[PDB]
Amino acid sequence: MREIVHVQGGQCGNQIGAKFWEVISDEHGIDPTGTYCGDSDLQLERINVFYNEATGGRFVPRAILMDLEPGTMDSVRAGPFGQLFRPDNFVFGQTGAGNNWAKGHYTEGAELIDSVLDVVRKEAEGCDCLQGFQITHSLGGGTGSGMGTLLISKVREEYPDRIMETFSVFPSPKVSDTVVEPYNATLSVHQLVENADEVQVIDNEALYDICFRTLKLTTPTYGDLNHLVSAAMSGVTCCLRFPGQLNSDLRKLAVNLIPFPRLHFFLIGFAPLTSRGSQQYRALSVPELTQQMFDAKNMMCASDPRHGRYLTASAMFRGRMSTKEVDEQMLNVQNKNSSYFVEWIPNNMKSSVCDIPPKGLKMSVTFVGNSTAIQEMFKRVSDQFTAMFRRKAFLHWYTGEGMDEMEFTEAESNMNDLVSEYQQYQ
Amino acid sequence: WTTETRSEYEPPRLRRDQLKAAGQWMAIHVSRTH
Amino acid sequence: MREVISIHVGQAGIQIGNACWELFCLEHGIQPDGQMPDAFNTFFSETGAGKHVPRCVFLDLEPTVVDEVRTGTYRHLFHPEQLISGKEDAANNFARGHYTIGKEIVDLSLDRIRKLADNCTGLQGFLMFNAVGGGTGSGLGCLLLERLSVDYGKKSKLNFCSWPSPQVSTAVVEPYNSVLSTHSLLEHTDVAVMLDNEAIYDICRRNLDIERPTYTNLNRLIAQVISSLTASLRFDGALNVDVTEFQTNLVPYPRIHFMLSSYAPIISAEKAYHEQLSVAEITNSAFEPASMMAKCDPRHGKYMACCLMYRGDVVPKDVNAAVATIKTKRTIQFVDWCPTGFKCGINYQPPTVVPGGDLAKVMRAVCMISNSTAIAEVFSRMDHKFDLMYAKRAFVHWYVGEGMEEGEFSEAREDLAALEKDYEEVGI
Amino acid sequence: MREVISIHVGQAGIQIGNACWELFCLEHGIQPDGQMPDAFNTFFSETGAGKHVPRCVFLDLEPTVVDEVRTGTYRHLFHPEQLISGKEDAANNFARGHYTIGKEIVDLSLDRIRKLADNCTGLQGFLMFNAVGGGTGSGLGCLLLERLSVDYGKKSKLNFCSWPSPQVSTAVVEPYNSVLSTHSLLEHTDVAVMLDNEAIYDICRRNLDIERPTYTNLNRLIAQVISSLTASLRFDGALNVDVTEFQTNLVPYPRIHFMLSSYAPIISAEKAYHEQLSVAEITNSAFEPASMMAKCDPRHGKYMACCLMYRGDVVPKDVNAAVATIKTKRTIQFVDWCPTGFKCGINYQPPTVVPGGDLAKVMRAVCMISNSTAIAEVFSRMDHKFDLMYAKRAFVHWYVGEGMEEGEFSEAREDLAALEKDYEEVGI
Amino acid sequence: SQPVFASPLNVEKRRLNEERALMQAQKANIQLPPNYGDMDLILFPEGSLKNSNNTVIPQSHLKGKSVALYFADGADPKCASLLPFLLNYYRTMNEGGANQKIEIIFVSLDRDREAFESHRAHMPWLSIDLENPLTEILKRHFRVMKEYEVPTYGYGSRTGVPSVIVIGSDGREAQFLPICSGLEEGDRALLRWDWRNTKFA
Ligand SMILES: Nc1nc2c(ncn2[C@@H]2O[C@H](COP(=O)(O)OP(=O)(O)OP(=O)(O)O)[C@@H](O)[C@H]2O)c(=O)[nH]1
Ligand SMILES: Nc1nc2c(ncn2[C@@H]2O[C@H](COP(=O)(O)OP(=O)(O)OP(=O)(O)O)[C@@H](O)[C@H]2O)c(=O)[nH]1
Ligand SMILES: Nc1nc2c(ncn2[C@@H]2O[C@H](COP(=O)(O)OP(=O)(O)O)[C@@H](O)[C@H]2O)c(=O)[nH]1
Ligand SMILES: [Mg+2]
Ligand SMILES: [Mg+2]
């Protein structure tokens, strides 16, 4: 079938990466010791989309782990569901690349990138049926931004016909440990526009705000923040794993959503969202998940969509349901929010059904959507970028390893381009 | 989990038994009337 | 010796053929294993001893729906080679299912067309099922219709197209697949029946009185349309028809071959007590403007031809008095150059009932295939929808980079435009 | 009486006749001891106490497969002296099989062939399998064919040969060895049947859906070709084609004797019940170019003669209708000087299926041995391989210090060009 | 002797049949020892086959069927991955028809009764209990070993577990379905099962 290659990069990227492999292993009924559990045909007929079979029958991951620390590599190895990952795909690099785009992209990260393209190669040319890549990384740091986008670039000239799909973690302005987010992220967006075609924006502001409000959480640990991300990750690729009535795809998502090819930045929702207090107490039906997917906070990015206009959206549903109820729910939500959709794109709503519900639920939906409110965060972190760039804030750590100041203004000019294109399509 | 085609496109004799267990079954009149 | 070949392309065609072959297998008494415990000669070849393989081919560029049929209960019914799985679905793109990934599938699917049509001479037609806005529904269907035109010259092609909805689209590239398919559907198919989706959702809502219908209930009603369409080839009747004269009785001009579809009665079993179903009222319910399966209001459409097929116990002249009353009733208006406007075929066998379906057992049924000038509204709304988004080059770079040339959209516009101007040239 | 003496030279020859002498034992009821629990004399001889030993010789210069037969499941069915093995492999060298080590094995080979001649009356032929890419098969293949043609030159010297495939092969010196077989498969061979592994692979992976097949799965397919070709010699019935009518309606010229095999009801278990399995389609599949058992497209050529050996429950009326539509189809062409260029071999014996193989219980089979001018192309790739090899003295010194004389390499290239000269002038 | 001469099932078959031959000759120009086609046995005794909830099914319900032995393990990832596909083939094929055509009899490589029952809880076809010696006799008869630990009689292991083998009336193997074999078609080898020739009579 369609092989999907998962690569996770960075301290942030490996933590969502491990949590994503809790979720899809629960969906496909796989033990942490690797063997399959149960008699569940509908979760095993499409096992090759994310898994490979391997000598003794262990469903080995197609997962590639890169991070230039001996940091979260051995914490996810010693943790639960960590004995799945191959003890070959772990590429460490024991020097550290702390909070620097230089130590991931140009220097240091460039010597270990020559071995992680090897692991991408021998995993992918085994079967020449690759539908896409799945990259997870944060742009507000070192290894995740630098070496993360460094693998992003070199994978695209070797397979220049297939999807790469980034569940990126953007700066998240308010809650921001360390001080070099405006330099690192702005000097990383201009590759996520050129050699990218499917970008998924994820902030820790709206991830915390989903926790504090739709779940009401008091001590939201980093484990269950990633559980919200991994649920949405498993829902956006549900059709590559389960049969359905209106079958979606990652390429069906890509062709249908993005306009002119630099507009590929998407909010993400996953909204059967309740607490455990009001967990028995909800009529879980199609007309009310549509009310929950289309109200601000439930979007995982901290850019408020009511200040903009959805150019094209998608409503990739998962569960037992009847189809004219999703069709009339898309039409009436376009009718009441007519100012929130675009006049030169009729019917700004993709729909699909993955049939098999998520584990535990009975219906769910993944709302990925292009918004012209997305430049709200782009101007936010470019404002932080120019406020530091005027006075020449901490830069000798960057240029000391070798980069030009002219390269930084190319990053700001290319990113200020993205602010203008969204504006003129708004 | 039982996907739609499996759950409804099963053979007619099995669906026959399953729904027999759940309750399957100018004007003109007959020659009597005048 | 009648022998019709069903070709299903696209994900819509595959599961609309699951119910189409659902109705055909339980009509003839053919079990899912293929055995019975010569009326079947038009849809089934008798293989070996006692088993009946369908005269079907299933095509999709994704495996996810077609190996679902292989792994389901209709495994041993079908010959395992015409089940065609691709490698990657075209993904809502006309250019990919036609140019790049559509080439590795047409050379082998038409190879089975070789081996399935070479059995007996006198092929009856091509019942092709597809979606219009789907990627492989429009692209792969176009490649088969072009290469069946060059391989078979004068053979009939009964195309059933699930047209885009007026309101629903479930895609934004839906005009880009609908407009560029009618480029390559006018000069290739012979009898093209247009179908909607929420028109039949409305049928399930009002006639069937079911709260939550879905696509598997769509395909049951459409299966009854195909069964009542080809009931003459399977079974005897008072006025037998044949699909080699449906084109000679429905379409006057070679370029206009677009028809509506209707069925009657659609009654739930719990409301079937309150009426005695007669021929003099199922014809009126068929002609009622909220009963068609395209959602095109026929009050502004001059009718040009009709094809009413009757099933079951029906006397031939309460048909004739039903057509007498609808000549004289004003709300359906006939065009002045076509004084007679009906063909009324009659078959003895009543329509069968699927177990677990919502259709009540009925002694008589009508299916109307009507050619009218109402289709001008169906194509003028897609006329407004396509160029409003093609105003500023939206989504064109996917098609251009996949094999289209910029300007193929342009010339596919003026021949869709020449399609509407012939309609009001008839209406005057 | 009637009999065919089988000579198996080379590792390919031993393993093709390995499956051959398994099928020949299964079809007669010859148990793997010689005891049954007169249509057997062509392949077996009585031995007084109910024992049937094959009329065979297994020749191989290496003691690695013959001694494996001597410690297998058929030890007490072969004659111990009929399995003649050397001590040192020819080891992919035509120089060993013809100049150095083919002298202590060839005198014993003609000794056992001599004893196999004067115990049977009516010696029909010398059906031989060899391994022309490979030292023992080609080298001893040349010496056996020359020495048999100086003391027995009169009888048939029909030969099946495993020519290398154009892309896939398992050596580097086989372009040398194959052109050095040309002066034994031209002026000594009466009937040459071209084979290669890759086309046989394609047959068993497209038609039997064995995606990853092995060597023994090719040997059973060949063994069915041998049994169906020599099916007239044993089983009675309709029009009978022996090994004298073979090379008189098929071989046009004294040196134009290269043909191809197309046994093609090749269906495993789950495509057989689903199909007709009729006379009309087995001919269409046998004439299909992708079902050619050696890799050679007949469209890039021109047929001179074809002999379709039908077997099973076929009747002559379906045979004459099936060959009639081969004339009508314009894809398949014949020379202008052979208007009637077809032979039929209708025999009344269903083919035998090995219990545990990859075939079904097929009721009707056909294998057609066809001479076409397209078989110049399996030597045209051979021209290109030898030209780049011999241009600057490739693996040559292994021949030079082993009995080979220079200039023999050049005249083999000129003989191969002389064959292509005849095959390009005959198609005019 | 089929498929292997040196089997415990084969030698008990041989001793019983030839003992009946000796007694018949003593009671009576009789071929001694008897011929293999004339050799007859009852392969599953009366208390062998049990379906779900442990009711006894005799051999008389396997007539006119296509029956197959399934050797499996509870902890084997191969067996766990192959089990839903065999449930799927079983349910769709058996219920697609007026009568049901195939039958599976399960034999085990589980360590204990708990693993046996935990693996049994998903299986609706017939089964042989671990403590019955027949699950070892058929094991040595069909050459199926997880590892080389039986003192084997010059065999090789015909396959590793899981295995489906269709069985004839007198213990002969009708055709091998190659999951882990020379063809290695994992989970697609169940398609190769034909059911017209291997009628258990
Ligand atoms: N009537 C009916 N229409 C269907 C059904 N399934 C899909 N469709 C229609 O098909 C359209 C989308 O095309 P699909 O058939 O789903 O997709 P496809 O033909 O495989 O081509 P791709 O979109 O590239 O996958 C939807 O807008 C539906 O209107 C069905 O079961 N019944
Ligand atoms: N079709 C088929 N081809 C075979 C078989 N065995 C060997 N071959 C072919 O034989 C070629 C190699 O030559 P061999 O037959 O193995 O060697 P040989 O004839 O003993 O001569 P030496 O090379 O000296 O050992 C390979 O390229 C195969 O194509 C077989 O069983 N079936
Ligand atoms: N959502 C989420 N954010 C994280 C996680 N780990 C780190 N972060 C954020 O990422 C920033 C640190 O970047 P980091 O991943 O350590 O950089 P790297 O190690 O060089 O890739 C912090 O500001 C955190 O807010 C995580 O598991 N989930
Ligand atoms: Mg579809
Ligand atoms: Mg040898």
Side-chain angles (χ1 to χ4, degrees), chain E residues 84-123:
Chain E
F85 295 119
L86 191 152
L87 272 296
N88 192 358
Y89 204 50
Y90 203 89
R91 66 184 183 272
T92 78
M93 183 177 176
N94 268 315
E95 172 284 345
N99 195 1
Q100 58 89 27
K101 324 322 281 173
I102 62 170
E103 188 68 37
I104 297 292
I105 304 171
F106 160 66
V107 293
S108 66
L109 271 182
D110 301 345
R111 300 277 82 80
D112 58 359
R113 289 282 302 102
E114 186 179 2
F116 189 85
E117 182 295 310
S118 66
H119 198 189
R120 283 310 320 300
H122 322 292
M123 293 180 183

Side-chain angles (χ1 to χ4, degrees), chain A residues 180-193:
Chain A
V180 298
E181 294 88 47
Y183 281 177
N184 269 329
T186 304
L187 183 63
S188 196
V189 172
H190 65 279
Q191 320 94 34
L192 277 296
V193 66

Side-chain angles (χ1 to χ4, degrees), chain D residues 169-234:
Chain D
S169 198
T170 63
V172 310
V173 68
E174 79 280 40
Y176 273 8
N177 282 349
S178 291
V179 298
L180 286 168
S181 308
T182 314
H183 65 279
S184 72
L185 60 83
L186 187 153
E187 69 257 30
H188 303 290
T189 293
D190 290 332
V191 161
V193 182
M194 292 335 287
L195 278 298
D196 63 358
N197 283 15
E198 164 185 309
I200 298 169
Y201 280 136
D202 174 328
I203 285 176
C204 63
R205 65 179 176 88
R206 283 301 71 101
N207 288 114
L208 308 167
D209 311 328
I210 299 177
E211 277 79 25
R212 205 171 331 111
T214 192
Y215 263 73
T216 183
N217 287 103
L218 317 185
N219 301 126
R220 334 291 280 280
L221 289 167
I222 305 305
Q224 293 284 342
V225 179
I226 312 306
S227 70
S228 184
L229 189 149
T230 63
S232 168
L233 295 164
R234 284 170 285 117

Side-chain angles (χ1 to χ4, degrees), chain C residues 46 51 76 78 80 115, chain D residues 270 273-276 284:
Chain C
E46 182 295 319
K51 175 172 101 143
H76 302 313
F78 293 97
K115 312 310 288 197
Chain D
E270 289 82 20
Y273 299 111
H274 294 267
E275 73 181 3
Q276 203 55 350
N284 297 337

Side-chain angles (χ1 to χ4, degrees), chain E residues 1-38:
Chain E
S1 61
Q2 201 93 8
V4 161
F5 182 76
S7 175
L9 190 76
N10 195 1
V11 298
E12 61 86 20
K13 154 183 211 163
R14 283 209 321 274
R15 73 167 305 269
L16 260 70
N17 280 302
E18 81 206 10
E19 190 276 331
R20 304 192 301 72
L22 309 196
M23 187 66 204
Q24 184 178 2
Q26 190 272 331
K27 181 177 74 175
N29 210 6
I30 301 299
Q31 183 66 41
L32 270 169
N35 290 318
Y36 288 149
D38 291 331

